[PDB]
Design a protein around this ligand. Structure first.
Ligand SMILES: *[C@@H]1O[C@H](CO)[C@@H](O[C@@H]2O[C@H](CO)[C@@H](O[C@H]3O[C@H](CO[C@H]4O[C@H](CO)[C@@H](O)[C@H](O)[C@@H]4O[C@@H]4O[C@H](CO)[C@@H](O[C@@H]5O[C@H](CO)[C@H](O)[C@H](O)[C@H]5O)[C@H](O)[C@H]4NC(C)=O)[C@@H](O)[C@H](O[C@H]4O[C@H](CO)[C@@H](O)[C@H](O)[C@@H]4O[C@@H]4O[C@H](CO)[C@@H](O)[C@H](O)[C@H]4NC(C)=O)[C@@H]3O)[C@H](O)[C@H]2NC(C)=O)[C@H](O)[C@H]1NC(C)=O
Ligand SMILES: *[C@@H]1O[C@H](CO)[C@@H](O[C@@H]2O[C@H](CO)[C@@H](O[C@H]3O[C@H](CO[C@H]4O[C@H](CO)[C@@H](O)[C@H](O)[C@@H]4O[C@@H]4O[C@H](CO)[C@@H](O[C@@H]5O[C@H](CO)[C@H](O)[C@H](O)[C@H]5O)[C@H](O)[C@H]4NC(C)=O)[C@@H](O)[C@H](O[C@H]4O[C@H](CO)[C@@H](O)[C@H](O)[C@@H]4O[C@@H]4O[C@H](CO)[C@@H](O)[C@H](O)[C@H]4NC(C)=O)[C@@H]3O)[C@H](O)[C@H]2NC(C)=O)[C@H](O)[C@H]1NC(C)=O
Lengths: 212, 209
């Protein structure tokens, strides 16, 4: 029966930018009225820390309690693969639940970023597919965005990372634009940001340039 | 009850008359003290049991992993029919529920575009051939690559993503020693989907000057 705990890593973007603030979030659900008290203990690489901001108990519609705890994580700590452990106690369980999260273990590998123009058979349609291929990155955490003329193209989709045959990861992003917008010869760019990239950021762009 | 799981057939099994599509009922966390599990199967309500309840198996922890399997008609599954697996275990409360069927809605036909590696990838000893498959519904799909009617092995295919029109897409990526691409060898993306004339289309890709 009883309470369950879930531990959530930061957003890859948060991790990779000095500006942003990465957080690790430990959430408890199914906390009865009979024993509503929950204690959190946090550990970084096995050693307790006490800077974690813990929200007041929010009652839920199944009459079950739910309490969140948020540890602010130093960027470089995450990127050096520090281990974050949430330890949850409730007088409703034999032993206090433990969860541990980190960046995945391995050597980082740098993203290769290629753009692919739409297929020839695709010109016949009203909308076109602009492809962004990102291969050979590790670990899998990553963000992918499209823009044109300094402004975000918000009509794209990105697949999850996929475990390649050589242990690394690949993925694809597909921006769909009104075919006319490609005709005009616009410039479209696929911004990618990952730990193994210089400045944690690269961008490549694409357009139609026939003749040579 | 201990966790119970229903599973569809694979896209491919369901798309060729020759194959044998099966629905699966994996029952986890069955314990030594009370195991003698019943399974019963119903399609669109009705009693059937042409199902073969696989002989048991244990696992890593103190737990058994047990399974049943039922063979299925290609049309029945393509026609939406629900498949339910009631799983009688008198260790805990009552019968168990799990329905599954195919996703509902007008099957849409996949568009298939082969893309070639970018110039930039050409300064490497292996290249990437891209196969875009978009606009398809439902997401049950199967993708393969080949050359000279012999099958290419070094490719991986991404899962399908909900595109913004409620259709799906995916990409499949074939990896070849850049020497082969030079030759001009033809490479084939083969997509199998219910909304396809004959459940199969194939697009070709080669070095065009
Ligand atoms: C009573 O009512 C309440 C609520 O109404 C019920 O609570 C629910 O209980 C469920 C358990 O039965 C919970 O389980 C699922 O939860 C997670 C997914 O939770 C996230 O996503 C859902 C939407 O899908 C959201 O609703 C949640 O709020 C969670 O959202 C994320 O929250 C994070 C922190 O808030 C967000 O982080 C942000 O990002 C910032 C970046 O810096 C910053 O860090 C902050 O973190 C924050 O800003 C994050 O972005 C949110 N994401 C989204 C998309 O919104 C799900 O993972 C669980 O699945 C796991 O566990 C099951 C087992 O139960 C596994 O089968 C499953 O596959 C997976 O576990 C896998 O296996 C192992 C070990 O288990 C792991 O090591 C693997 O990694 C793991 N993953 C795999 C295999 O893929 C689970 O299904 C549900 O969250 C609860 N809801 C709420 C609101 O809390 C309660 O159950 C009810 N009880 C009853 C009896 O009725
Ligand atoms: C002791 O150790 C053992 C061994 O480790 C533990 O066993 C584990 O038991 C778990 C029960 O808790 C199992 O559940 C998890 O996994 C299922 C998915 O199952 C597949 O996934 C993994 C691969 O990652 C495999 O290990 C499994 O075996 C399953 O493999 C697929 O199953 C089929 C087998 O028949 C294959 O297809 C068949 O193939 C045939 C030919 O080969 C033929 O073609 C057939 O036609 C075809 O069917 C298929 O190919 C297999 N392989 C792959 C790679 O796919 C997962 O669904 C569970 O999570 C879901 O449900 C939980 C509820 O507990 C939710 O929390 C969670 O969110 C999640 O989704 C939600 O579930 C609800 C239902 O509750 C749905 O209605 C919702 O829609 C859904 N949400 C959303 C948003 O969609 C769960 O994660 C697990 O399989 C076992 N693990 C292992 C390693 O074996 C055991 O736990 C241990 N015991 C104890 C006490 O600790």
């Amino acid at each position: 029966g009883g309470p369950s705990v879930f531990l959530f890593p930061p957003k890859p973007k948060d991790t990779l930018m000095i500006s942003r603030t990465p957080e690790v979030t430990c959430v408890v659900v199914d906390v009865s009225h009979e024993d509503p008290e929950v204690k959190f203990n946090w550990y970084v690489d096995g050693v307790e820390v006490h800077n974690a901001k813990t929200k007041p108990r929010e009652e839920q519609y199944n009459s079950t309690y739910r309490v969140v705890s948020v540890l602010t994580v130093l960027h470089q700590d995450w990127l050096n693969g520090k281990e974050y452990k949430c330890k949850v106690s409730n007088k409703a369980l034999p032993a206090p639940i433990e969860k541990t999260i980190s960046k995945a273990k391995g050597q980082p590998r740098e993203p290769q970023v290629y753009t692919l123009p739409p297929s020839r058979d695709e010109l016949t349609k009203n909308q076109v597919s602009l492809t962004c291929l990102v291969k050979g990155f590790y670990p899998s955490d990553i963000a992918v965005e499209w823009e044109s003329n300094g402004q975000p193209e918000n009509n794209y989709k990105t697949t999850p990372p996929v475990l390649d045959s050589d242990g690394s990861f690949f993925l694809y992003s597909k921006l769909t634009v009104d075919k006319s917008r490609w005709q005009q010869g616009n410039v479209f760019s696929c911004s990618v940001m990952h730990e193994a990239l210089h400045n944690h950021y690269t961008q490549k762009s694409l357009s139609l340039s026939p003749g040579k």
